[PDB]
Amino acid sequence: MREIVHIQAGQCGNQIGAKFWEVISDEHGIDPSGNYVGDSDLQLERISVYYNEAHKYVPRAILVDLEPGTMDSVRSGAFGHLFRPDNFIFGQSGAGNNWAKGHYTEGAELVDSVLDVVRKECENCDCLQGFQLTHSLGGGTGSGMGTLLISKVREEYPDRIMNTFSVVPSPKVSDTVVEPYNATLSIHQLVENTDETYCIDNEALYDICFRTLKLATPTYGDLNHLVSATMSGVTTSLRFPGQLNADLRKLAVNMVPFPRLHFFMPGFAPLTARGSQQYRALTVPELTQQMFDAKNMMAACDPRHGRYLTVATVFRGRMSMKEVDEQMLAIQSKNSSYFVEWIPNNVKVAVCDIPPRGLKMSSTFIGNSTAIQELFKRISEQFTAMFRRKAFLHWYTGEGMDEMEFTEAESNMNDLVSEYQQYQDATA
Amino acid sequence: DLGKKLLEAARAGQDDEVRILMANGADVNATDASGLTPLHLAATYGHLEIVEVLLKHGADVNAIDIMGSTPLHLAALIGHLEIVEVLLKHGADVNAVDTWGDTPLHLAAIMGHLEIVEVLLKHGADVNAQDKFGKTAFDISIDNGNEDLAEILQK
Amino acid sequence: RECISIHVGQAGVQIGNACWELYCLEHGIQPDGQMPDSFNTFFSETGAGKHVPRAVFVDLEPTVIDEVRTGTYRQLFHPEQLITGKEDAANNYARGHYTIGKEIIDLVLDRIRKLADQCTGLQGFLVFHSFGGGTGSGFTSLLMERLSVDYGKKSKLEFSIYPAPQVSTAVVEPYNSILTTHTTLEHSDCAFMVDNEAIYDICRRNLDIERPTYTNLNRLISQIVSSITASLRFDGALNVDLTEFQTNLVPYPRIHFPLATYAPVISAEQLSVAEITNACFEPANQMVKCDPRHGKYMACCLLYRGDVVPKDVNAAIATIKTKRSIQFVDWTGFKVGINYQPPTVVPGGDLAKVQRAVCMLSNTTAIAEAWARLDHKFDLMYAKRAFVHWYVGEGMEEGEFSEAREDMAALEKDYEEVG
Ligand SMILES: Nc1nc2c(ncn2[C@@H]2O[C@H](COP(=O)(O)OP(=O)(O)OP(=O)(O)O)[C@@H](O)[C@H]2O)c(=O)[nH]1
Ligand SMILES: Nc1nc2c(ncn2[C@@H]2O[C@H](COP(=O)(O)OP(=O)(O)OP(=O)(O)O)[C@@H](O)[C@H]2O)c(=O)[nH]1
Ligand SMILES: [Mg+2]
Ligand SMILES: [Mg+2]
């Protein structure tokens, strides 16, 4: 279980993807030219998980968009010239938020060139773990082409783990009314074809920046500061030696009791604004209670409205493993009602000594909570409002789709909701 | 048939063709197979000038299609604020109820069109109006955790 | 004569590291195998003068065994007896037993045969493994099935690590534990369970270690392993062969899980024979949490080591039968072994040197409480079929869960019927 192959698709996918490679390159001591410049050999022990070694470390990253301009903006970022140039795969226009163009026409015209590059990266892997895709669900390319890519990769590599960071749309951030269509069509594909999906909710990211961080007009840069701090925390266990959730498959076996209920709620503490001076690091009690706080969730759901099936928590920084154990035991004790009794010992704790940049103490929560149904219900309600009036359907069906895929996607997502509800009400 | 041409020109935003078609006698209140009129279609697809032209020449601002949708339902759903204002100015029924029990307020609330929600409220949208499942727009805002919308619905 | 030790998965390998480190010290062997004969049961002899463990280490991932290949004992073992695949069992019994374990099982058996061929009188195998890991549970079961076919007359003993939430890193460990106990039961002659919670608690309370690591746990475990295998390595008079373990401890073949109790455990910071013998009946020195006063004894051995006079053992044994309520099943003795060498402790270690020590091995029905605990956690998850799809997708049928569980319910009934 060594190599992970990263794929970033569409504008959102490539923007959060670029930020991820910036952030983990700093943690691992990789500079924008690919040289190692770090001071700890913990940094290099698992470098092969995310980097090819030519002496020069190159991200195992594949960059895709129907929109050609995305190649340019990535390349102009700090690490843009470290990506392998032949791993940029781009089309001629852009899908205009049309999931069907992404999945069936223009995106299907481009996908085999993507798979060629995927194939080529998978061949150099000693022991391929599987795949990590960053995308948004509300656009046309990251959603429609991204999910086509997932299915084609799955059939060609059925024994490897497929993981996504999927950015869920909110009207607070993007007032395009077809995004619930695109999200719902995509969620149907993610239910059947991924092993684990981190739900990055723009609704939650906006609320955090607006209400907690007091940012007047949150930008994508503000949202993405939270995303990248989440993506670094939830991959810490993959990127450094350790005992818990050390690769994608052990993570999955710990986090997924039922194959369809593989949508995770990412939480993070402390929540920071960019260019702020986080002074007075948090205590261990503070990291613990803040991690389970609805206001630190990257999914817009209240965990205390549902129940935790499984949870993983990673503490980063110099602190007492003994007081972490005590605080974690305590928050389960007091809140036992919120943790399903029929999955004993369902909260796992790791403590990793290297903190992220900017912080001396931080923690990351990964929850499989039935409260995630609130996010699915929100998307479903919007989808249904639009679909009942058949608004803009011809725009989709004129690209090869049948109306019945809408119906099938809606019913699958509502089935997903009922399943969360079923285990939420289940008793030992 | 000029009615089917006018419906398609209202939908596509073809202002000149709308004008030439009406001058040849096109039925301003023509309906497609589902009961949508040229005004429903212009309101859906955001074509404000065609909305104004149709209203100045006899379009029924409160026409319903087969599902009980008015133009104002569709403008509120898709989120076209200027069109919502023009429809209300021309006597649109702020509280029209469709076959799902929805009012324009329910649809603007669901889709997060907060500025339209406020306009509808100031024009007397019924905060007590219940959909077929018994929810008012305020229920929708509480059930889905939308605190910005919940505050506006009580201003 | 010979015994072959087999260490499977992370826990089995790392405990193996600690046991052979201790064995080497007990017998005067250096980490390169040189020594300036009783322990020939456990060590072959090159005749460059090199004494090599009759030991195999197997893991489906390389990381833990790579440390043995580049550590202090990098020259102790046969390098072809350090065997690793590339993808581990992912905490999944089914991957250790079927889909991944199948890629390396033949190599492992061929390498065991190589050891077996150097033996003039092989007694059998000592097998070290966790219950909770995918390799420790699934590949062990597979290996024990193959060993039963390929070595039908040989004895097989286990040292098995029973899971504890304090150091657990998988929610599914109760599944792997029941699956491997079911499939190994008919192939194992005697098995010594080590509850990680009991060892953890001893480390905190007797060694004043606030947060025990593996290393702390494993050095304590290996002192207990050593007291159990010393008869095999020092030509004792009790438990001289592997077959004798069954004879002395297992009067009933499915109920083959003795409780180990060890004393004294003293922090690096002297007790009489009567005192350490009394300490054998205190629950805090047990290697498995349970209550022998709520059960019946079927067989008991006391294994002393150090400055121990037989008359003082006989007197102390007389006192405890005439004071305590040690109820033996009616179908009632103590067997005694004395090794006169002083207990050894590792340089590094947390344990004080002591002048005399004892390990009691008692087959008590109270260990059924340990099974009941695992079974109950199994039942909670299985009733919802939580995580079951991971197993069914890795070469296993769903009915194997209920077959394993019914077998555990029979085993619990076996304990109830003996008393
Ligand atoms: N959090 C976050 N969301 C983004 C970002 N960029 C776009 N989005 C969201 O993504 C959705 C639109 O999808 P895009 O990534 O822009 O579309 P695309 O995948 O490039 O597909 P097309 O442009 O239709 O071909 C909306 O919900 C946006 O709010 C970003 O940098 N960060
Ligand atoms: N006492 C002790 N227990 C250990 C050690 N290593 C792991 N464990 C316990 O072993 C169980 C799971 O770890 P390992 O289980 O052996 O897993 P594995 O056999 O390598 O199998 P996979 O990694 O799933 O392929 C848990 O109960 C751990 O607490 C160790 O060195 N000593
Ligand atoms: Mg785009
Ligand atoms: Mg392992």
Residue numbers in the entry:
A (entry chain B): 1 to 42, 45 to 56, 59 to 360, 369 to 440
B (entry chain F): 13 to 167
C (entry chain A): 2 to 37, 47 to 279, 285 to 346, 349 to 436
Text lifted from the article:
Similarly, dinitroaniline compounds disrupt specifically plant and protozoan parasite MTs but not mammalian MTs (Fennell et al, 2008). These observations imply that fine structural differences in the architecture of drug‐binding sites between protozoan and mammalian tubulin could be exploited to develop novel parasite‐specific anti‐tubulin drugs. In this work, we provide a structural description of apicomplexan tubulin drug‐binding sites together with the comparison to their mammalian counterparts and use this information to rationally design a parasite‐specific tubulin inhibitor dubbed “parabulin”.
We solved the structures of T. thermophila αβ‐tubulin in complex with DARPin1 (D1; (Pecqueur et al, 2012)) at 1.75 Å resolution and paclitaxel‐stabilized T. thermophila MTs at 3.3 Å resolution. To assess structural differences between protozoan and host mammalian tubulins, we also crystallized and solved the structure of recombinant human α1β3‐tubulin in complex with D1 at 1.9 Å resolution. The overall structure of T. thermophila tubulin is similar to that of human (RMSD of 0.49 Å over the 751 Cα atoms of curved αβ‐tubulin, and RMSD of 0.77 Å over the 801 Cα atoms of straight αβ‐tubulin) or yeast tubulin (Ayaz et al, 2014) (RMSD of 0.73 Å over the 755 Cα atoms of curved αβ‐tubulin, and RMSD of 0.796 Å over the 789 Cα atoms of straight αβ‐tubulin). Next, we compared the details of all six known drug‐binding sites in mammalian tubulin with the equivalent regions in T. thermophila tubulin to identify structurally unique features of protozoan tubulin using the three structures generated here as well as the published recombinant human MT structure (Vemu et al, 2016). The residue composition of the maytansine, laulimalide/peloruside, and vinblastine sites are identical between T. thermophila and human tubulin. In the case of the taxane and pironetin sites, we found differences in one and three amino acid positions, respectively. The most prominent differences between T. thermophila and human tubulin were observed for the colchicine site that is located at the α‐β intra‐tubulin dimer interface (Ravelli et al, 2004). However, the aliphatic linker connecting the two rings of CA4, which is lined by hydrophobic amino acid side chains in human tubulin is replaced by polar residues in the case of protozoa tubulin.
